A paper describes a structure:
Lysine benzoylation (Kbz) is a recently discovered post-translational modification associated with active transcription. Here, we systematically characterize writer, eraser, and reader proteins of histone Kbz in S. cerevisiae using proteomic, biochemical, and structural approaches. The Spt-Ada-Gcn5 acetyltransferase (SAGA) complex and NAD+-dependent histone deacetylase Hst2 could function as the writer and eraser of histone Kbz, respectively. In addition, we demonstrate that a subset of YEATS domains and bromodomains serve as Kbz readers, and structural analyses reveal how YEATS and bromodomains recognize Kbz marks.
To elucidate the molecular basis of Kbz recognition by the YEATS domains from Taf14YEATS and Sas5YEATS, we determined the crystal structures of the Taf14YEATS-H35-13K9bz and Sas5YEATS-H318-37K27bz complexes. In the 2.4 Å Sas5-H3K27bz structure, all H3 residues from K18 to K36 have well-defined electron density, including an extra tyrosine residue (Y37) at the C-terminus designed for concentration determination by UV spectrometry. The H3K27bz peptide binds to Sas5 in a partially similar configuration as the H3K27bz peptide in the hYEATS2-H3K27bz complex. Two H3K27bz peptides overlap at the target lysine (K27) and the flanking residues (A25-A31), but diverge at both the N- and C-termini. In the Sas5YEATS-H3K27bz structure, in addition to K27bz-mediated interactions, H3 A29 and P30 make extensive hydrophobic contacts with a hydrophobic groove composed of Sas5 L28, R31, W82, and F108. The downstream AP signatures are only observed in H3K14 and H3K27 peptides, explaining the relatively higher binding affinities of Sas5YEATS with H3K14 and H3K27 peptides than other peptides. Although H3K9bz and H3K27bz peptides show opposite orientations and their lysine side chains adopt different kinked configurations, their benzoyl groups are inserted into a conserved binding pocket sharing nearly identical interacting networks. The lysine side chains and the benzoyl groups are embraced by two arms: one arm is composed of a pentapeptide (residues 59–63 in Taf14 and residues 60-64 in Sas5), and the other arm is composed of a GWG motif that is the most conserved motif in all YEATS domains. A π-π-π stacking interaction composed of Taf14W81/Sas5W82, the benzene ring of Kbz, and Taf14F62/Sas5F63 dominantly determines the specific recognition of benzoylated lysine by YEATS domains. The Sas5 K64P mutant, which may generate a more closed binding pocket with increased hydrophobicity, substantially strengthened the interaction between Sas5YEATS and H3K27bz but only slightly increased the binding with H3K27ac.
Residue numbers in the entry:
A (entry chain A): 1 to 139
B (entry chain C): 18 to 37
C (entry chain B): 4 to 16, 31 to 139
Write the structure that this text describes.
């Protein structure tokens, strides 16, 4: 939109098999995994996503309180499980300027990986703009 | 809530405490 | 404008079935009673590709061999507007469901009368 700009958000994921586990050969290892949502500034650099007021990790429903609300930075979550799954990361702009959803795949193929997502961020509203203008040139 | 397929799946990559 | 989730349930054993449903306030699958018509825009190789279903359930039975992308055109009641769902037909699962979040107009009195049976309005 000519009333929005493109902003890249980054999901940084980590996971490791928990050491010292008593598991048989046909049984799944438990892993400590973690995810954090960052923002890319105009240079390509990781910065705090200060244009978001709230972030929700919609975990797989086998977890309990699977709707994990994060009302403040940092938008970090860590957890223990055995399974890979796709999750909604529901992100809310500051200034009540709207929301978007990132569909992120939690996978255990690497020790750490990052995935980038492009979003249309509105640049018409004043309160969101004062924060956006710290990272991007707005029309 | 009845789940759609994408949110419903949970999958396991490997068994054992061995990192592949 | 409020958010309503439309869910397409596809089955196959190919005798494949599709049925457009919607999620109510609790997330239970219910028939999309907020829709006038629901046309399934099949692939051209089928005869009479446009399948107009004037009444509920919006449920089709068909036999085929290929996997195609399918337009599910949905009209709101009281001529409140249109929207299209892009559903891909696949065969490596005997059954699956896919959700689709749609913006529904909140300024058509006839449409919100049926909308109000299920959700609270702004």
């Amino acid at each position: 939109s000519d009333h929005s700009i493109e902003v890249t958000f980054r999901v940084k994921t980590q996971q490791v098999i928990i050491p010292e586990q008593n598991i048989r050969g046909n049984e799944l290892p438990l892993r400590r995994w973690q995810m954090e949502l960052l923002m890319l500034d105009a240079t390509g650099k990781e910065v705090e996503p200060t244009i978001l007021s709230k972030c929700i990790y919609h975990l797989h429903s086998s977890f309990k309180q699977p709707k994990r609300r994060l009302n403040s930075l940092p938008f970090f979550i860590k957890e223990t499980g055995w399974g890979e799954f796709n999750l909604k990361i529901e992100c809310f702009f500051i200034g009540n300027a709207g929301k978007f959803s990132i569909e992120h795949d939690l996978t255990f193929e690497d020790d750490a990986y990052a995935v980038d997502y492009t979003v249309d961020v509105p640049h018409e509203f004043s309160h969101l703009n004062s924060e956006l203008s710290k990272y991007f040139d707005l029309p | 809530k009845q789940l759609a397929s994408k949110a419903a799946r949970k999958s396991a990559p490997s068994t054992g405490g061995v990192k592949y």
